[model samples]
Target: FLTAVSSIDTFLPVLNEAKLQWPTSALAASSEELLGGYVGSQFYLQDGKYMQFQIAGSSNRCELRQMIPDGGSEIGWAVDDGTTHTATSSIVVPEQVDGVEEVTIMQIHSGEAPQLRISWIRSKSLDGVAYEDFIMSTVRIGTGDSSDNFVKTHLADRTAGAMSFQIDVKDSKLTITVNGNVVVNGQDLSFWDGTDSCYFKAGAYNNNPTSESATARIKFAALAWVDHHH
Candidate 1:
């Protein structure tokens, strides 16, 4: 039940670009070549740097994989689900490290700072498509300590529109900002040595972007040890 089709799409066109191949429908077959996922045309991410993915059909979880001259093997995995069709998912860089190292997965939860590791990353896809398309993502590491679960943290409270904020911990001070604007500043004399982690919340904030009430369109936020040993 497998068809050997030749590819004509040029690689030069997709060079240095985050590109994906999406079909208008699912290709289901019993053959290994045509099982759960289909190779639509030819998808490529030369360096496998910052990446995004679309989960389609009946699958909600994906196995993290690394490709070599031979093939690909699972390294880590990411799992998330809005569950509903047309749902969206996303992952960003480490606000604080720079340069390229490895691509890890993100774990999501409500009212907590986003979690990053070589675990599971989950996101929703756009509605009304045969299969959702993967959004282009950029990755960066934060310039923080490497102590592993030793950094204190905070989470976003409310959200509206598409803006969100969270308090960050780095030694002994905390910063609260809304859409990049400082709102409240709190100090903890005992919080000097630092705690363990941070928390973040994402959702549509009320009365945020407007004449009436608009806010950042956030679902959840989390604060965790970035650039730590994993």
Candidate 2:
């Protein structure tokens, strides 16, 4: 999220083309607050601002997005070229309620891959029946002519309480964790001979509604290309 959005500067060319509200993002400068509205469903905010829907997914996912007036938060929507940045902080799963949920986190080696992942420190199954989970796969690897080629992919297994994934390389190791436990340990997974890059994502899902689940909270979240700093 970018800061310093305002009213007067909102109507500039960038806002006009992107068609996003300037006042709300302007006020987001206040820090640690949500603009407070759904991307659609036509619900109105008491503040007289309108909610815009740029993209909607069939999975009932909606987004509340704003464009930076100065384009300073330039990295907000850059397509991943299968390259990871230096280091991202943590990828938070946001909320964790037991019995009927999931948290995911994902690192994309490519932009078109479009799959992110989320992990939680704890999870519970209602009837000892495995329910909701996540998967990561490749949609692309190289540029234009070679975009169809995929490099590497794995399905994160959370059956043992902590989700596990690895890509072991000779020089360094990477790992990810949530709630003080490791979810992905890279020392075991970075299987490349050269440098590696990827994209990351996360979310929640539920497989059973009849049973209760473990409660897990996401402290903070981010994705970085660090070799191994977990």
Candidate 3:
């Protein structure tokens, strides 16, 4: 009973069951909207397959927030409790507004503070060629109040195509990989000690304000989470 190769079942399956945080609202997978839940013009199911998250440059964000299974009323993971938590995704940034300099694509948050931010930084080379570089930044827990708490590292060029990313955390240690290449390996995250409500978020969160007509868009082909507990 084989039919066409392009089917909903074979598309970006994760999106159909994922929770989303639009610029102004949050949509759960079980929402009444047909598939992937829709919110105004900011977040919606694209091409009947991929999940497209868009936000005005000056808007706050449009992201996917994580949820822990079977942990009734409680979300996120406790890394110090011997649990390995990870978030993996295949994403594409089709374009960016001219004046946009940075956009956060992924994050690990503790309460309301950001512990890590994976972003796309737009810059022009000396030769006048514009490029978007992938970068990772981490902030120590106690130093969250300061804007200078982040330690940043350049990873790779975010070319005009899909790229895969994996972020893993366990025992207060963190590792990040882009396209299977280890960019951050076993970095000390002891600064995140004493936190338990840490969770992951993915999508476009503009770091700078833009004109009213400008917007940031990010598409997710595959988005998933893994958790191993002792």
Over 1-230, each residue of candidate 3 has an lDDT whose tens digit, in order, gives 22211235532333332355666434533322324324445665566655567787454687766654432232666657677888898888676767566778888886767778887777534224444455545445456556445556676777677888999988988888898999889877777777888888787887765464568777777776764542
> What is the alpha-carbon lDDT of model 3 when measured against the actual structure?
0.66
> How close to the true structure is residue 105 of candidate 3, measured as C-alpha lDDT?
84
Predictions ranked by lDDT, top down?
Answer: 3, 2, 1
Model 3 spans with C-alpha error above 4 angstroms: 1-7, 10-18, 24-36, 70-74, 124-132, 144-148
lDDT for 38 (candidate 3) = 41
What is candidate 1's TM-score against the reference? 0.22
After superposition, the stretches of candidate 2 with alpha carbons farther than 4 Å from their true spots are 1-57, 63-109, 114-116, 119-174, 187-230
lDDT of 2 by residue, 101-191 (tens): 4332333332233322333323333234343443333333333455344322334433433323332222333443433455445432223
Order of the predicted models by TM-score, top scorer first: 3, 2, 1
Top of the candidates by lDDT: 3
Query: What's the CA RMSD for each of the models?
Result: 17.5, 11.9, 5.3
**Candidate scoring better on TM-score of 1 and 3:** 3
Residue 161 C-alpha lDDT in model 3: 77
TM agreement with the true structure for every prediction: 0.22, 0.31, 0.79
